[PDB]
């Protein structure tokens, strides 16, 4: 199984409006079927404000951006017709600030208010997040106070009341029903107040489903091994963080120390990315980094068991280095030619890293053998060629700093694996392992 | 008569999914007819890839984004309810790269290459525009060179040629058979090599049509009066200009030559704009400005024969530095509240110079007798309570370096304004005006 996170807008334009969406996205199953692509991980596609479209102003219709509901469903009927399966990221953790049952929970309806989080005389009025360590409770000026981990314009929804699980189950089988197939859970571990709570919420919520379903969950162990069983795809931030650091540091010891941590025995498939929407781009890690390294970072991914995922745009080394409060500056337009001018080209905005003549449009890396897309599409070709890694088990034969050798292998399979970070070859049983390269055999 | 230009993805959604639409904009039919609004110049509504959408590639299909022709009509029916006529921006000047037209040219299709204009053994290639002084001509692969005024993907369509005449002529009829009320054409200086030709061009293009057809033509009022009484309307870039030069000056000496060369005595309507697309907003004229003189300018532009115009949001003092290639970061989002988060409200984008809890939304301004909005609301319906003014005569009572005395009058109307442009006050005829302040008796 191999993945790709697509931000609909920046992706296809099928319609001639510089406008990524639906009918685009139909189009852009060749390129997809190329890369080697099993899924697409699709940001929200419903009704939303932001041009990101996490806080959700209505779940039952989708971005008219985008297109129409009959234009989606067709378009799910036409990857399945190619054997891709479509993601969707679903942010059921909270709602917008204008949809209708919040709306209506301002007004007073009782039905709705319950819907939502509100002070008790015995709340903690200066409570905050971890990260952000911003305040999560929010004033109305009635004198209220409603909760909001996301901001005050992204109301949490109260899964202690048995009837929010039941619209949002509701929700679920209806996308399922309609031919999605499987969900991103955005902050699955903020469902209920407290942990335990939270492992039981997606137990019963999950339950009688089938389909993939992906979190982030930061426990960082043992309950991350709990939510993992019930899930069955979790979102690798640790491995996915230490393949380019070591990278970058040229030294084995986090990547190791990561992979015996968050790769080893586990009862649940884990995820490992390039990157995604909430950091800087692959090619723009820490102050960004060179063709070899980016290259080696994919080779990395592609060589390690659990399922490799591309955000989009990385298979190309594109840049960006992640800002706030304006997050589209690593969303910029994915380029197909040089011109940045062909049909089902998007421009929606003047791009802030990638614009045109950069060589780096699909077209023009198509053609050099040394281009990280005609480098990735070589290691995507490999792991489709061995679905068997996915779930794979991890020996390590040499563990120096400068470089790293394990074996992978499970019943009917065995691949030793060369990664050598640093620059000057180094022989590894009668193996040539070259600077910054992977070698399989 | 008051004009309007609305950048249509900025200004008002209305389909909840944060784009400007046609639908939204149907919404807002409220605001302007409480604003004094007229007619309003949409840009560019059809097929195009880019943000702004001035390279079409389709004349006869509307930008999704903005929606349907079900959608749009529905607009054209709405706003028409209320008295207010819609002009659409019609770029019918060049295509875009990827119109069916120039793709065909470029295959060498008999018929559509001689839609476009192609170099010359008797061709300057290194020819420039007058403006930034740029190449007109731009190469291909295989030796050819086209002819592109603003640029490589904006090829010129050749107006020698009758079919593009006729072409071009059955589309105007098309749009006008929709209910639309008129046009804006671009680059109209343009449409013929001679200014002798061009004449000619537009006398017997718009010579049975009826409608309100708004043009630049740069002959520097010159030529200009030749195809005012052609289009019968010609925006006014001179005293536009010159009003905000002056009130940056305090120095009434370029309004008073600018009003004797471009207002007073046409045979048309001159419109004067606060601004347009293609420069900064009048709040960020050099350096940009106090709220004191927007209000000046504002005041001046409401008080001098001819038809004011305001492009989007100058009515709240909306900040935009021009610049490029980005030219979005003058086509900011319309704020509507504060937290820019209510139904009807776009976000397809951070601001770049307006972001939210500014307090310049119409809803924070609106409760504000102080406001830049409230000032635009009394000259808008003061100017609406005085329509004998767009063709009345101006002479002046009074010259003086700081301040400015003049008399709107006609057969049966008379009206004296007293402008301040000095931070300090002023006296005429027992008569002070307080600095930046004006009066009209
Ligand atoms: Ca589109
Ligand atoms: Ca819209």
Known sequence: MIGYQIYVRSFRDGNLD??????????????????????????????????????????????????????????????????????????????????????????????????????????????????????????????????????????????????????????????????????????????????????????????????????????????????????????????????????????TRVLIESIERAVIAKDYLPVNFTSNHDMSRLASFEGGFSKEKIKLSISILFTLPGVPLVFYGDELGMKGVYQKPNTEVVLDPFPWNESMCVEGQTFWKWPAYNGPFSGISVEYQKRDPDSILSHTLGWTRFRKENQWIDRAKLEFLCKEDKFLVYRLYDDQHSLKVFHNLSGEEVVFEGVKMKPYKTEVV
Chains 1, 2 share one sequence.
């Open 18 to 251: 510089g406008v990524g969406d639906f009918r685009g996205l139909k189009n852009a199953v060749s390129y997809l079927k190329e890369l080697g692509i099993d899924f697409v991980w699709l940001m929200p596609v419903f009704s939303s404000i932001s041009f990101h479209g996490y806080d959700v102003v209505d779940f039952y219709s989708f971005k008219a951006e985008y297109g129409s509901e009959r234009e989606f469903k067709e378009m799910i009927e036409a990857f399945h017709d190619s054997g891709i399966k479509v993601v969707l990221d679903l942010p059921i953790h909270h709602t917008g600030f204008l949809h209708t049952w919040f709306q209506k929970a301002l007004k007073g309806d009782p039905h709705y208010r319950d819907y939502y989080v509100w002070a008790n005389k015995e709340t903690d009025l200066d409570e905050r997040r971890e990260w952000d360590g911003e305040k999560i409770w929010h004033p109305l000026e009635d004198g209220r106070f409603y909760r909001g981990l996301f901001g005050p314009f992204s109301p949490d929804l109260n899964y202690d009341n048995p009837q929010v699980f039941d619209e949002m189950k509701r929700l679920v089988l209806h996308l399922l029903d309609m031919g999605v197939d499987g969900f991103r859970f955005d902050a699955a571990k903020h469902m209920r107040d407290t942990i335990e709570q939270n492992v039981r919420f997606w137990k019963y919520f999950l339950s009688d489903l089938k389909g993939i379903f992906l979190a982030e969950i930061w426990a960082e162990a043992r309950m991350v091994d709990e939510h993992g069983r019930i899930f069955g795809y979790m979102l690798n931030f640790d491995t996915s963080h230490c393949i380019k650091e070591a990278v970058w540091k040229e030294n």
